[PDB]
Amino acid sequence: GGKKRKKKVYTTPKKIKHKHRKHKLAVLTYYKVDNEGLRRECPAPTCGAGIFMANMKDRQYCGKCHLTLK
Amino acid sequence: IDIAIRHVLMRQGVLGIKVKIMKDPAANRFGPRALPDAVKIAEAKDEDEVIPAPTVK
RNA sequence: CGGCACCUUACGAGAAAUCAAAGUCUUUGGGUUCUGGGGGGAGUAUGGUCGCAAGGCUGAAACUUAAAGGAAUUGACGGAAGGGCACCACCAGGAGUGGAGCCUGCGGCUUAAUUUGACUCAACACGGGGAAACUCACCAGGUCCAGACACAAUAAGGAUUGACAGAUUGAGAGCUCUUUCUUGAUUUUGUGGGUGGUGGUGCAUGGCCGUUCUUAGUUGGUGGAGUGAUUUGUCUGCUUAAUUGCGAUAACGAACGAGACCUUAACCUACUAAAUAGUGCUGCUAGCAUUUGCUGGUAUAGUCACUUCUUAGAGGGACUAUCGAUUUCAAGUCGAUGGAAGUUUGAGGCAAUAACAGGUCUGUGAUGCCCUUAGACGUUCUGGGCCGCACGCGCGCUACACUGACGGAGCCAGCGAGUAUAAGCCUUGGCCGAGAGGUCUGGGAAAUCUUGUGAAACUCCGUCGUGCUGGGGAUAGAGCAUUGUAAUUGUUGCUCUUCAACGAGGAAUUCCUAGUAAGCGCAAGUCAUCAGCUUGCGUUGAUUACGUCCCUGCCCUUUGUACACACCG
Numbered sequence A: 001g002g003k004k005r006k007k008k009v010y011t012t013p014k015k016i017k018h019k020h021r022k023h024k025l026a027v028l029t030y031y032k033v034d035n036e037g038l039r040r041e042c043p044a045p046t047c048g049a050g051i052f053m054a055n056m057k058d059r060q061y062c063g064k065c066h067l068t069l070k
Numbered sequence B: 001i002d003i004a005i006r007h008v009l010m011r012q013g014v015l016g017i018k019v020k021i022m023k024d025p026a027a028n029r030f031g032p033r034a035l036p037d038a039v040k041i042a043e044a045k046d047e048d049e050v051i052p053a054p055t056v057k
Numbered sequence C: 001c002g003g004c005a006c007c008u009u010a011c012g013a014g015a016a017a018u019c020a021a022a023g024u025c026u027u028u029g030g031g032u033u034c035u036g037g038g039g040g041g042a043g044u045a046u047g048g049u050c051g052c053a054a055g056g057c058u059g060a061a062a063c064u065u066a067a068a069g070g071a072a073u074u075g076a077c078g079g080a081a082g083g084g085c086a087c088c089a090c091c092a093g094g095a096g097u098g099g100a101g102c103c104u105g106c107g108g109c110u111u112a113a114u115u116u117g118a119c120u121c122a123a124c125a126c127g128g129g130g131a132a133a134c135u136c137a138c139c140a141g142g143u144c145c146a147g148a149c150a151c152a153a154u155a156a157g158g159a160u161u162g163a164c165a166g167a168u169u170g171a172g173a174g175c176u177c178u179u180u181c182u183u184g185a186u187u188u189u190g191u192g193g194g195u196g197g198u199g200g201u202g203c204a205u206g207g208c209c210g211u212u213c214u215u216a217g218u219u220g221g222u223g224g225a226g227u228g229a230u231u232u233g234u235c236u237g238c239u240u241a242a243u244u245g246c247g248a249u250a251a252c253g254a255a256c257g258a259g260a261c262c263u264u265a266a267c268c269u270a271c272u273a274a275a276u277a278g279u280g281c282u283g284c285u286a287g288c289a290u291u292u293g294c295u296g297g298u299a300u301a302g303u304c305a306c307u308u309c310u311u312a313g314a315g316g317g318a319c320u321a322u323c324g325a326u327u328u329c330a331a332g333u334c335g336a337u338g339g340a341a342g343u344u345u346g347a348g349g350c351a352a353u354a355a356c357a358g359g360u361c362u363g364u365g366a367u368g369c370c371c372u373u374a375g376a377c378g379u380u381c382u383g384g385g386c387c388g389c390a391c392g393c394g395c396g397c398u399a400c401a402c403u404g405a406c407g408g409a410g411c412c413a414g415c416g417a418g419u420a421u422a423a424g425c426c427u428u429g430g431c432c433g434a435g436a437g438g439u440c441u442g443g444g445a446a447a448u449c450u451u452g453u454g455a456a457a458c459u460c461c462g463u464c465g466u467g468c469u470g471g472g473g474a475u476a477g478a479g480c481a482u483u484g485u486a487a488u489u490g491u492u493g494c495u496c497u498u499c500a501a502c503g504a505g506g507a508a509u510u511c512c513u514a515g516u517a518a519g520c521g522c523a524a525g526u527c528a529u530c531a532g533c534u535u536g537c538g539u540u541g542a543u544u545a546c547g548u549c550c551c552u553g554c555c556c557u558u559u560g561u562a563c564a565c566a567c568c569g
Helices: A026-030
Strands: B002-009 B014-021
Touching: none
Parallel strands: none
Antiparallel strands: B002 B014
């Protein structure tokens, strides 16, 4: 009973999940150094220091705090 | 009559078991002590000898 | 002495049926003739022979085939016989159904899908299946792993987790994409292997349920019969609702089923009690007539009494009791009388042995095997479907009117159910609203409140006046409310308007014997909402039997059988 269960035909194309993007040694380009001598930081009371924003279209956004300014 | 029914798991399929055990009515401490149609008649107290008519004041 | 036979026995014979020969036959020999050697082909072909002919006599082979056949046993069946029985049978009848409109299920057709099981009784208001979402299994799409655990790999200089803004999507799914941010060894990937599945198989199963069949039926021990399968027990007659009894008896004693039993209804001025039942009195008091009367309210502190009515433990009562009759005069049966009750007093629950390829894998974290398991047949969300309509069918509800419809008035049950920081129960009373409904209170986890559930049929007084009529109210337009996240494919309720078919239903066919049938509502189940359905409950309350075996079947005996897949042979 079930009439030779249908063998699926897919109108849409095969779809691909998302892996995690890579970024070699992120802390290297996080910090700036000069010899013999940096994006921004979330100010929310959730985390505090040690969280970096990004540079989108003149916009900021962290990851450990889903908040945007300006 | 008390009854127990169990399922038995076998490699080929389930086996069912039913056990029925009838107990002795005379050994029943809860409800009736005999079957409803079981009739018990007392033994007679007869074949006695009688002395004609004395009186014990 | 001879003859035609018969009855009993069974030493003996025989596969048995049976046999005074069919005995005197493996303990095998009185004389003698004829015939057969698995079933067919076939008493056919051919040759011969007899015959007027029809035919008679003689008489092959090729080829084909695993049985054919005999006697008996148990069952089943019989347009066989004899007994008995049943409103899922009839009879005498009642109500009908079948005809219309609609509700609902089934087929068909359509479909993106219209998920699926079931097809005579024993499928079709059945799956408690009254599906808007969920349910949900189907259809068009989008997520997620909730893939345990052990390996191996990648890899901390990153295994991997999420998510602002856009694009994107039905979607404010970071599903996916540009974006560099976040988090950190629980995870990712390959292997092994798990897990889930309303996926398949009820013809692989357990459990449960239905049916045979709700009739009276079923079984072993020892003994008797038979070479055996089997049989007697378990039965002529009478009797019973009954394999239940009287009895008959190659049995005897037993076991199950029946009956007993349990629940429920009817009686009890007889026990125990009642401030959650009722009452008589008594205060305080009403209206009406004053005889000290008639009808009421009130008082769960009136420091009263009680148990008829109500409630429910603890009992009583019926056993056919008495009397006539009849019959083994045994079992019983029929009339009366008394009785609350005399059909087993009424109604049910329970219910043997053997079975069915009956239904259920879609109740089950009940299950074997198969299938599938990351673009899933797992799960979840959005939307649709299960309702789709030339048509056929089943269970039903409304009707076709005057034994009625409408309007007023009268005004009486019984079984039941009910909640709290809700996802929210039963709702009295007060207020608003034509209604439906809204609002504020208060009672009730309940013999206490809803509730005397003031139910409907019905009763009374009028209006209508024999017509598709004020019968009927399908279909449809407009508006108002309520449940729900969501009412479009009208959820349901209410108001106006619209006002179909139907004039008692062909062949057929269902149910029913007394508080029954029919009519009439009510409560509970399903349930946010919705009952034309089920399960119970009361109200009003009959006509006709109290018989039979004609039809349809059931039980037992005898009997026939070429049946055993059992006469649908």
